[PDB]
Chain length 58, copies 2
């Protein structure tokens, strides 16, 4: 797990998953996660959030 070096980066992404859950309801397999980097000692953690339909919830 290359994201284990910090131990917080993956803690925040999983948090946004529970966060979107507190306000909505989606699975972890629906949210993608991908880290990138720039030529200047910089990183870029991007995460896709595929939300499904919704209507039964009011």
């Amino acid at each position: 797990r290359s994201d284990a070096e910090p131990h917080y980066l993956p803690q925040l992404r999983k948090d946004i998953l529970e966060v979107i859950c507190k306000y909505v309801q989606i699975d972890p397999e629906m949210v993608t996660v991908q880290l990138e980097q720039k030529d200047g000692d910089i990183s870029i953690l991007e995460l896709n959030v595929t939300l499904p339909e919704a209507e039964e919830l009011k």
Copy 2:
């Protein structure tokens, strides 16, 4: 603001920003946000997180 219809989607992304702050420290202009959709009544909220260098923090 097309993301104002739900009022929670943008609340979770801003939360992950503060979350990465509680465990680290970055600006909102460093994290990108982009929503997408599929041909099946589905959405895809992707957000880039450009993290800067780090060392002064122990």
